[PDB]
Amino acid sequence: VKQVFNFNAGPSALPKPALERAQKELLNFNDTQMSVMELSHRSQSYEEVHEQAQNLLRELLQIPNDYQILFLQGGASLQFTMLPMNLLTKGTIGNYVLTGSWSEKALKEAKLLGETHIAASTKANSYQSIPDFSEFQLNENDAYLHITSNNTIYGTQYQNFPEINHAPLIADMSSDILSRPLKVNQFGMIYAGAQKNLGPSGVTVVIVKKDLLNTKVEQVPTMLQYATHIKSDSLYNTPPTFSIYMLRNVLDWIKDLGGAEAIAKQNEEKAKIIYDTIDESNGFYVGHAEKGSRSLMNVTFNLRNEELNQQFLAKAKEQGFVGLNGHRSVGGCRASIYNAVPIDACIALRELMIQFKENA
């Protein structure tokens, strides 16, 4: 039928082959004559999937052997409280770098549980950039330093990651995990809801340095201890089996296209198509981010006034574009271009943007 271009911000476009694969075996997985959704998570067919999803992630990001991969429910939002619940002990400080709204939500939850600090923030200038690492105020009693690698709502992104030795570096990578190569040993823990760049909603990937968190924390509910899930290999209680399966399928696709290094090349190219369009528009489109901080995953921009914003977004929706409205808290526009968004969608958006501009 008509064209559909999926720029949804979360959940988001999946790679077609992962969906086609799921569709074909939805009723009979691995010749069991059952859906993967109808299997015991103690079955060997399921355990194979669970282990493969882990091994693909390990290979793709080159995760070291002293790290474990957890598959948890609850979203990144639950990690906002689980992290300080496990690591923010008395006399210690949850130190946060604020580079958008998701960073503030993480901070707020630690505030409920302990001493917090703000190491650096670009909030004053409306989160248009990543602060310089030299501005980071660090504390000897920091439990960790927490960052948001990709600021989904504001369209900014870390180009690289700080070297931190006094505390573990923790990162909310929900909207850019496995969009590029990563030196995992820079971190104590990485977490990501899967629904932005790794597949479906319902599972959260948590990559953790085992010895930072494989020990029982007194007074913490069993389900909320990392130790619980480390010890049980994310099978303490029933996992989100279809979500993990779909995650597996998406990881297979990333591997098939050449891994993190190849997908970064694709992601830089799609992003360039949109940013060049903005940059050649003579101010008709204005990107929110400063150029050195532009995200490769979420492109945020405004037209010159809200009336034009609305007409542009209404025209897009009529032409088949989905999800371009900016986050409700900031307005404007947001083109989410995660791994699986195809480049011809980006070209289509460029065409839209140029004809709208020329015809305005």
Next chain:
Amino acid sequence: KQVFNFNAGPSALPKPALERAQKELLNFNDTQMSVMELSHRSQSYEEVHEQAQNLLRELLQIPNDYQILFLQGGASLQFTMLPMNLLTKGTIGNYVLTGSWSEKALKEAKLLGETHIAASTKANSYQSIPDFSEFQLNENDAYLHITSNNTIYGTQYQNFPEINHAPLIADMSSDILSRPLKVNQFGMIYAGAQKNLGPSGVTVVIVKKDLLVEQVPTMLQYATHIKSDSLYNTPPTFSIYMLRNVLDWIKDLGGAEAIAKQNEEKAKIIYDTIDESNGFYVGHAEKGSRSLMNVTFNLRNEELNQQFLAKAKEQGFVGLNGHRSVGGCRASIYNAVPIDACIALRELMIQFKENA
């Protein structure tokens, strides 16, 4: 290629729900996207989300003063979320112990506050539900918690106690919407979907609104999710979609009373087989407490137990091994397990007995 799915969790689902999911997996509602590819703030998703709630409300006849929540973390997270929200200082989390899942819930409450055992059939290895006249209740109970169906032990409440000093709270993971319910008896009901309602990944929480908070993490407050209609953060959208589909199937067959008829016939097939076996098969539960959802039994010795389960597996039956904590056999016959599978089990049970 015959397979009979007696898995205990996650479990068999209705074929029409899975076929419907398959057919539109790539193009949901003519959007040309999977339901999995939709924003949870889209109208497209929002209608599915609401439709799932509406079907539960209809099918269980849930009054207006109850809210229906879709949460992540399984029934296991509810074990701690409940006392986190309701077990305030100077109050008591009171538990009725009718199996190991009861025990797991009580354990989490003990982390957070004072607990109490209203009644327990543990001494007799959980062969029955205690007499409600036996309950020991406290003026300062924050709640009375029960497990409606004791998944590992094969026992089930026939009816529920009339409790007015405190909210009655029930872990209905393995029997929710397998029969009609009087929801007004409860302050809260919760269940992982993965037994009777859908795939794993979503937990249904039915809560008396005005019943349920300084210092609890935002995600762990019921009020967060009540206030945001379970859209505070990204919900498990595909699991809720599948839950909708399963609920449409239950509605289509005639609702909670109709599925109870089917379930009672399924259970009747197996229990009759056991009772007519002259002691060859022995059920764990006392008759008066027999579950309609998990039928637990053993052969006369461990070696016959093992021979039977091996024969079963060879013949395409899946999931009949009892829980590791108790051994024996367990036939889980949740809503979507078809009567034909129970008939097949019976026929295997009878043939095995003849050939022993």
